[PDB]
Amino acid sequence: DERIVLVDNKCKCARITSRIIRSSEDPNEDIVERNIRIIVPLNNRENISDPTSPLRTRFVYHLSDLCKKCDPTEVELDNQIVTATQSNICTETCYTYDRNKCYTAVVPLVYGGETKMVETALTPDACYP
Amino acid sequence: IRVFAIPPSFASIFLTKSTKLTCLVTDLTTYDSVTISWTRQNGEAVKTHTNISESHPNATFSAVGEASICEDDWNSGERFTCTVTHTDLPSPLKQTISRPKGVALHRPDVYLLPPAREQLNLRESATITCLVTGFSPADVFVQWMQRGQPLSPEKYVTSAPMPEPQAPGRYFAHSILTVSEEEWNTGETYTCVVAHEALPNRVTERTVDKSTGKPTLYNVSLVMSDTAGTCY
Amino acid sequence: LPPAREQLNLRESATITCLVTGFSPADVFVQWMQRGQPLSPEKYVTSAPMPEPQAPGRYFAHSILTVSEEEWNTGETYTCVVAHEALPNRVTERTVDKSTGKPTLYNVSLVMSDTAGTCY
Numbered sequence: 001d002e003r004i005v006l007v008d009n010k011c012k013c014a015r016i017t018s019r020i021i022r023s024s025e026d027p028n029e030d031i032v033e034r035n036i037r038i039i040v041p042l043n044n045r046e047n048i049s050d051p052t053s054p055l056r057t058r059f060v061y062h063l064s065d066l067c068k069k070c071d072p073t074e075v076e077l078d079n080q081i082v083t084a085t086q087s088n089i090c091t092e093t094c095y096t097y098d099r100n101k102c103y104t105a106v107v108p109l110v111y112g113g114e115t116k117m118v119e120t121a122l123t124p125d126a127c128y129p
Numbered sequence: 130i131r132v133f134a135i136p137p138s139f140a141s142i143f144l145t146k147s148t149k150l151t152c153l154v155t156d157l158t159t160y161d162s163v164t165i166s167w168t169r170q171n172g173e174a175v176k177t178h179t180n181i182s183e184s185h186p187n188a189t190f191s192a193v194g195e196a197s198i199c200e201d202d203w204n205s206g207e208r209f210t211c212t213v214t215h216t217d218l219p220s221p222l223k224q225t226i227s228r229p230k231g232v233a234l235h236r237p238d239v240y241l242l243p244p245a246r247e248q249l250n251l252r253e254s255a256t257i258t259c260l261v262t263g264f265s266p267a268d269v270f271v272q273w274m275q276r277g278q279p280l281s282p283e284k285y286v287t288s289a290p291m292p293e294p295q296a297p298g299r300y301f302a303h304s305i306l307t308v309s310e311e312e313w314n315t316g317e318t319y320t321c322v323v324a325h326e327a328l329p330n331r332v333t334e335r336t337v338d339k340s341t342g343k344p345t346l347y348n349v350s351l352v353m354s355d356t357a358g359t360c361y
Numbered sequence: 362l363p364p365a366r367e368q369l370n371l372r373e374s375a376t377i378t379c380l381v382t383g384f385s386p387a388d389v390f391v392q393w394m395q396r397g398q399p400l401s402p403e404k405y406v407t408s409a410p411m412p413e414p415q416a417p418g419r420y421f422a423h424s425i426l427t428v429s430e431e432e433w434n435t436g437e438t439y440t441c442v443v444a445h446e447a448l449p450n451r452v453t454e455r456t457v458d459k460s461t462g463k464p465t466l467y468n469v470s471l472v473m474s475d476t477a478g479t480c481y
């Protein structure tokens with residue numbers, strides 16, 4: 001209740017919260033706190049959509065490209081309504097999987113000579129077809 | 130003279146889309162006096178094609194009969210009987226095959242166990258096991274692969290399903306594959322593919338290698354830059 | 362630019378700065394907002410475009426807004442709407458606030474696991 005969520009990334013599992021604590025009583029001596037929580041996977045591979053990819057042992061977390069806003073907002077100017085660009089900075093790699101997303105693959109299946117490629121489910125359960 | 134009747138399998142339905150019935154007959158001395166036919170409960174005739182195999186070393190002959198039936202015929206549970214007639218048999222042999230009812234659907238679970246640590250020290254071979262448990266009914270199809278290349282039907286073995294003593298109604302089976310010690314030490318990948326009706330997409334796969342699954346050490350590197358950037 | 366630290370110690374007022382730079386031609390329109398309602402024009406002063414010494418053909422301008430110290434310490438939000446012909450959508454917006462500024466504390470936490478391969 002006393003914390004405000006800024007970003008809730010799922011691919012990098014990054015979550016940032018900010019909070020002001022009323023330390024002492026002088027209004028000019030209150031500290032501003034920034035919390036970062038990162039969960040890293042140790043079993044996932046380089047490309048989450050290809051099981052043959054090698055393992056990944058290097059993780060990079062840029063905070064300038066995480067707390068960024070990229071959706072035009074509406075602004076009232078007393079004579080019209082316009083769309084405004086939040087940031088000008090606006091291929092990112094997905095470290096972990098997303099529950100709200102489904103991951104599938106193509107695999108050759110041989111039986112009596114004939115080969116039937118069928119869609120698989122890399123994720124354990126995720127969504128249903 | 131014994132007759133073996135094999136009901137259609139789920140894999141044959143999925144990958145061929147044509148239900149077939151087979152009642153293999155062995156221990157036959159003469160192939161010119163054999164006849165394989167299928168009759169329905171009401172007596173309607175079913176077209177059956179009879180094939181004659183080669184000569185077995187034990188002075189026996191086998192006849193193979195493949196016939197096309199509708200998926201409904203089998204799935205409806207309609208009881209079918211294969212008719213075999215021979216001059217040496219005073220009475221024709223009858224076999225009863227049907228699919229039981231009152232069976233629910235349970236999603237199976239798949240796990241791979243890496244080769245034992247004290248097996249690699251002998252530097253002879255490695256064994257990988259694919260354990261699938263918690264499913265009903267008891268028809269499964271497990272196929273092994275190596276980095277997208279289907280493996281030969283001879284390098285791996287599979288066992289018939291058996292009941293689970295703990296929870297009745299859920300079964301299990303496993304597939305064992307052997308590999309060269311140097312091949313596994315190189316770092317090649319292997320996959321376990323299982324086909325069953327209970328799965329949402331009806332096929333699942335899992336992947337193991339040397340680096341994943343009971344490893345020796347964990348090497349991680351982390352970089353956190355731009356920690357004082359603009360957030361707003 | 363957030364207000365200076367040495368200004369808020371007087372308990373009198375604050376000063377927020379909206380800076381627009383490197384644009385051609387020399388035409389710019391800046392307006393301040395709070396909670397979606399336009400502010401009174403006097404609360405702010407906007408200057409005329411001026412040349413940039415280090416880059417020919419480019420200009421810059423400024424805007425200054427004055428607010429109370431207690432209002433800034435409470436945690437209100439402000440907005441600078443800037444319009445120029447060369448923008449992709451002709452209108453841009455930024456927002457400043459006390460909480461989302463320079464933090465004294467960086468409580469970083471990292472959790473390692475070999476089974477959490479997915480995040481909701």
Ligand SMILES: *[C@@H]1O[C@H](CO)[C@@H](O[C@@H]2O[C@H](CO)[C@@H](O)[C@H](O)[C@H]2NC(C)=O)[C@H](O)[C@H]1NC(C)=O
Nearest residue numbers: 046047048049050051052053093103104105106
């Ligand atoms: C990670 O894996 C995916 C899936 O294989 C790669 O993208 C696929 O590329 C093939 C052709 O090579 C296409 O048939 C698929 O449609 C692509 N997938 C999607 C979702 O569009 C992707 O290129 C791989 N990434 C790297 C870096 O190799």
